[PDB]
């Protein structure tokens, strides 16, 4: 499909940069921590646009990266976990692993409602050799599409989001979910597409990103429990 190059650019970008440790960087703050979940933010505002890069890490017992990415990507289960959208639909299917989605986000007073139009792609990045697990990634990034032009009702946000998952598996007996741990890195770079009250936006992000990570990861745990493990 016509976006194959852009997909590879985004996958490469995230594998090169999004797994780099920000813990030693004075500009990055740990804003929320609960259990194995850590949410970081770097405050960035340019010409009255709040861009605050966000990065979170998590470690989720009993699920694989393939499972986590499938659930994050699969639109059929989206409404079971996502709480920040008013509506969404698939604009176009590009490939078995790549779709273009239009969605509107719930309005947060006093700001105008935002909409977003993004390519969502799920990819397996194999290890150097078969004895190593390596990574599953979902990239959600804004693209242009003639069927979803700008409208006068919503401010068009632009996003670059990735969920990156690595799976740790620890006799001749069957592997148990007790011995699997999924290490998650989640990054979100959102351009709100226009002005917003900075403190209101920042408070919403600080509330909603951890809420999402907790809800979504617990959802994957609930839905995979008892089911055969999809490595
Ligand atoms: C005063 C408020 C001003 C508001 C202005 C900013 C609004 C920007 C809306 C754009 C938000 C895009 C969120 C990304 C969504 C997708 O990748 C995905 C599936 O929906 N979900 C998450 O990554 C989970 C997303 C979790 C979000 C908390």
Swiss-Prot record:
Changing residue 140 to A: Reduces ceramide transfer. Transmembrane segments: none annotated. Changing residue 82 to A: Reduces ceramide transfer. Shelters ceramides and diacylglycerol lipids inside its START domain and mediates the intracellular trafficking of ceramides and diacylglycerol lipids in a non-vesicular manner. It is found in: Cytoplasm; Golgi apparatus; Endoplasmic reticulum. Interacts with VAPA and VAPB. Interaction with VAPB is less efficient than with VAPA. Interacts (via FFAT motif) with MOSPD2 (via MSP domain). Changing residue 103 to A: No effect on ceramide transfer activity. Residues 7-225 form the START domain. It comes from the Eukaryota. It is linked to Neurodevelopmental disorder with hypotonia, speech delay, and dysmorphic facies: An autosomal dominant disorder characterized by mild to profound developmental delay with hypotonia, delayed motor skills, impaired intellectual development, poor or absent speech, and behavioral abnormalities. Some patients are non-verbal and non-ambulatory. Additional features may include early feeding difficulties, poor overall growth, seizures, brain imaging abnormalities, and dysmorphic facial features. An N-acylsphing-4-enine binds at residues 82, 103, 140, 186. It comes from Homo sapiens (Human). Widely expressed. This is Ceramide transfer protein. The START domain recognizes ceramides and diacylglycerol lipids, interacts with membranes, and mediates the intermembrane transfer of ceramides and diacylglycerol lipids. The PH domain targets the Golgi apparatus. Inactivated by hyperphosphorylation of serine residues by CSNK1G2/CK1 that triggers dissociation from the Golgi complex, thus down-regulating ER-to-Golgi transport of ceramide and sphingomyelin synthesis. The gene is CERT1.
């Amino acid at each position: 499909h016509r976006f194959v190059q852009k997909v590879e650019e985004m996958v490469q970008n995230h594998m090169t940069y999004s797994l780099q440790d920000v813990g030693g960087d004075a500009n990055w703050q740990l804003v929320v921590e609960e259990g194995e979940m850590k949410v970081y933010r770097r405050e960035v505002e340019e010409n009255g646009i709040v861009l605050d890069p966000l990065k979170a890490t998590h470690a989720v017992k009993g699920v694989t990266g393939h499972e986590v990415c499938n659930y994050f990507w699969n639109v059929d289960v989206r409404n079971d976990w996502e709480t920040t959208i008013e509506n969404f639909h698939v604009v176009e299917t590009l490939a078995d692993n790549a779709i273009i989605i239009y969605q509107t986000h719930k309005r947060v007073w006093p700001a105008s409602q935002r909409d977003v139009l993004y390519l969502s792609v799920i990819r397996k990045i194999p290890a150097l050799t078969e004895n190593d697990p390596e990574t599953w990634i979902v990239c959600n990034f804004s693209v242009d599409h003639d069927s979803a032009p700008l409208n006068n009702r919503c401010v068009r946000a632009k996003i670059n989001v990735a969920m990156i998952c690595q799976t740790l598996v620890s006799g001749n007996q069957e592997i148990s979910r007790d011995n699997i741990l999924c290490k998650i890195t989640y990054v979100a770079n959102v351009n709100p597409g226009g002005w917003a009250p900075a403190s209101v936006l920042r408070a919403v992000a600080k509330r909603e990103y951890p809420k999402f990570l907790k809800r979504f990861t617990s959802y994957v745990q609930e839905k995979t429990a008892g089911k055969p493990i999809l490595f």
